[PDB]
Subunit: 137 residues, 4 copies
């Protein structure tokens, strides 16, 4: 709850929420992805007049990192305005996370700084993945 | 669910796989959803030249059912040609399933008829859902 | 473009489909109905999700239903909404899905009073990316 | 010779193509987004074992810009390995672009550097947009 990298994750995630583009849901979400070498990529949800075309904070962050060449992820924290609920990643974000590993941490936070940690494997058990298309050889 | 419906659901899932439009991945998937009153709705994956625009069998089936006024689901079965492993729903499909409850059954099968069952809740722990947007 | 009879049936079907719309978040109901080459009709409605990006449009619900039942030859698709002074137009993602199955078919963008504007898929998605690209 | 900003866009778009994560299609795509103040944001397609969960280069680039506070877009260029055919944005990407304006440019290129430029409006006529969702009408 207080290791340096945890503090960094929570602060960045909380800060990233400020850039959210969510005029439809008015539900801002921020995310901060921590890579293996210590770099942090932030993200926020970006909605669309046509709801299906919006994107979640977690994926905004992951897509940013990958586009810049980072594919080794250590952890990701998520922030929202819900004070009485730990903000949890939707199934779609869990699947994208899984595309890059099942062994990394997801910090589901509350505005007060408290949080619950679960791995991608735990958040997406018996996961569909690269193996289904026989891509691991 | 009733073994009578279980079998009908499992076969419906495989038959649906025949209509799959998947020229890009060449990975056909079929699904069949059983509603509270016994009606079954099936679906298949439908790809698109631009990959993100494709849709999964599970959601094709769920969307079909909802469009007909059915939102009470008891179970959903999934089928593919993957021999080495039970076919499981991707995270996106799990989230759509969750929109309509966490206590129902998901049948992940193999081409030989064997399968494993898990509830939506077990497939999507600590899930985000409608409650997050209430109050 | 097709006969006023098929157009009317498409019209009534999309409006009727719109009644099943699951849209508690936007409270913006949308209905759609498409006509296959052999004259069959398949309809759909938008179906949203707590996580907005996982919702689906009425057009794609209709299209996906038809395909799942073996139909891939489409002649026309009609869209209906509750917008009074706006012809409801298909979003870009729906146009791309429509394109996957041809560019030479009609899209009927209607208003609640039955008035409409019809354009081909090609006209709604010019210089489109398609199966040929791959 | 092309205007300075056009050369930058074309080259950045071509470069972003290298970070493409596309093991399923093996069809790399790069994008470069030019903002009103001159900053360029790049993107690449990032696929998923479950095809529908992938993202296009154009949205990867647009999401990166927005996540950092940039919504004023001037132009975006797309690059691919398709030698004889200008790479055009899919319909989903055109809708995301439209969320932030219809009067800006889209540069559809080929590897040799030649291109066709159309506005978002021209690529997505009679578009559905934020306006259709305004409560007062
Ligand atoms: N022509 C379109 C445009 C929008 N929609 C649906 O309307 C809601 C708000 O974008 C979302 O539910 C979206 O899917 C639709 O079904 N068809
Ligand atoms: N953990 C999650 C959950 C939700 N969201 C975003 O919040 C809005 C409502 O679901 C939508 O904008 C949705 O994308 C998110 O970005 N990350
Ligand atoms: N102009 C476009 C067209 C396609 N793509 C990406 O290419 C792959 C096959 O459609 C998929 O990875 C798809 O996202 C893209 O990124 N931009
Ligand atoms: O949730 C699953 C996972 C994957 N697929 C489909 O399998 C193919 C491989 O990704 C795609 O067409 C994808 O939609 C399903 O239908 N359901
Ligand atoms: N699946
Ligand atoms: Zn998500
Ligand atoms: Zn799926
Ligand atoms: Zn649409
Ligand atoms: Zn695209």
């Amino acid at each position: 709850v207080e290791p340096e990298h945890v503090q960094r994750l929570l602060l960045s995630s909380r800060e990233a929420k400020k850039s959210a583009y969510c005029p439809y849901s008015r539900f801002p979400v921020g995310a901060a992805l921590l890579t293996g070498d210590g770099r942090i990529f932030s993200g926020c949800n970006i909605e669309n007049a046509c709801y299906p075309l919006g994107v979640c904070a977690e994926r905004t962050a992951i897509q940013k990192a990958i586009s810049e060449g980072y594919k080794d992820f250590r952890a990701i924290a998520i922030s929202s305005d819900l004070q009485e609920e730990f903000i949890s990643p939707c199934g779609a974000c869990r699947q994208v996370m899984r595309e890059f590993g099942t062994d990394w941490a997801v910090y589901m936070t509350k505005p007060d700084g408290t949080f619950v940690v679960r791995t991608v494997q735990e958040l997406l058990p018996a996961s569909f993945g690269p193996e289904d298309l026989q891509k691991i050889q």
